[PDB]
Amino acid sequence: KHELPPLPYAYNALEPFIDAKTLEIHHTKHHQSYVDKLNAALEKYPDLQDKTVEELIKSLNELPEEIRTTVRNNAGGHFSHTLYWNIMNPATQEYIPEELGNALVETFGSIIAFKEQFSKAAANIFGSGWVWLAADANKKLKIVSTTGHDNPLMTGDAPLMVIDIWEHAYYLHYQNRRPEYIENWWNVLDWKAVEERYNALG
Amino acid sequence: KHELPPLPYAYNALEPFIDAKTLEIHHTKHHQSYVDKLNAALEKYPDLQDKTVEELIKSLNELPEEIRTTVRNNAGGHFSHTLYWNIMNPATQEYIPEELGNALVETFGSIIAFKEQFSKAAANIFGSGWVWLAADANKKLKIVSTTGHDNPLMTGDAPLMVIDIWEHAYYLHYQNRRPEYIENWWNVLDWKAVEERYNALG
Ligand SMILES: [Fe+3]
Ligand SMILES: [Fe+3]
């Protein structure tokens, strides 16, 4: 049975960039519910309780039709919120590690250029979705926009970082001012965590 | 140039079912934006500036590809928000007009049965979307769920009423408790307006 991972920090630890109430609801209501709903679907097909969230996402078309959609949405949700919590950290002096910084500069023109493109893709999401940094099988980086809780695992890629652009992520403190939310979010991005995932790809 | 119609009632008029702040922002920021965005997409195409939001939606596939998506989304948005404001009114005593009442009973089992199925479809929306009551060429009724600002004009149907299930519609007062928002919304549904649209279909 999958379980809601605790946040690596307190509900009020990302203030003022993300408000405490949101963080608490975002985790204990929105994320919790993806877990609950994933759990209930897999209970009908227990042989799938032994799969990782990621191998579920990558094998959607082999799951029974009955639950395929629930899983795509809810495993997607669980996975995507898990990454989101884990690549944020209480506001720390920005230091980008060399390996990740160099790759960003090589790919986009500079750090600022990547931030701009990422910010812009996030501003341009229509409806509920996410904006990712992701690597392909060959460690090539791209910025990816997705709808719902779809994600790059589905297109055979390795997610490195992501921002939640569902309105629930920012409405209580920013209402419609999503760009202000995106700009604030950079202050709690944990580059160290992003580096870790990058590095692990070898 | 398309314009933002004013609300048919005060910003505080749907309290406590819909809060004033939401109404202000939902209208002056979110709705305004679909208008502004629609206008900007049409700037290069004076031949299309003469068309109604509805004939734009009906002609998506024939529009220039450059703007097809922006129009779908922003005409969709304009149209859908416009109906939404206009099918709400300050909370009064429920009176459902006979023609509409009879059709609902004939189609669903009873009024309560229709409210249940409608409420349920709205509760089960994944992501950003809307739930509609809609009529076909023959005034047969159905409940339709859509994603984004997609809408039943796209399937050749006549929209009668709709509820906005984007999170911005309800997050400030209900946060994650969408069912509570759905339940409260029935109190300000203007059945007379719904009847009027039904009646017009002959
Ligand atoms: Fe979220
Ligand atoms: Fe809306």
Numbering used by the authors:
A (entry chain B), B (entry chain A): 2 to 203
How does the study describe this entry?
Here we studied metal-preference evolution within the natural diversity of the iron/manganese superoxide dismutase (SodFM) family of reactive oxygen species scavengers. Only a few metalloenzymes have been rigorously demonstrated to be cambialistic in vivo, including some iron (Fe)- or manganese (Mn)-dependent superoxide dismutases (SODs; SodFMs); metalloenzymes that play an important role in cellular reactive oxygen species defence. To study this process, we leveraged the existence of naturally Fe-specific, Mn-specific and flexible Fe/Mn-cambialistic SodFM homologues, which differentially utilize these metals to catalyse the detoxification of superoxide. By combining phylogenetics, biochemistry and structural biology, we demonstrate that SodFM metal utilization can be evolutionarily fine tuned by sliding along a scale between perfect manganese and iron specificities.
CPR Wolfebacteria represented a striking and highly unusual emergence of dimeric Fe-preferring SodFM1 containing SodFM3/4-like HCterm and VD-2 residues. This included the novel categorization of the SodFM protein family into five distinct subfamilies, the first comparison of multiple members of the largely unstudied group of SodFM4s, and identification of atypical isozymes such as the Fe-preferring SodFM1 from CPR Wolfebacterium. In some cases, such as Nesterenkonia alba SodFM3 Q/H, a single residue has a major impact on the preferred metal co-factor, while in others, such as CPR SodFM1 H/Q, mutation at the same position had a negligible effect.
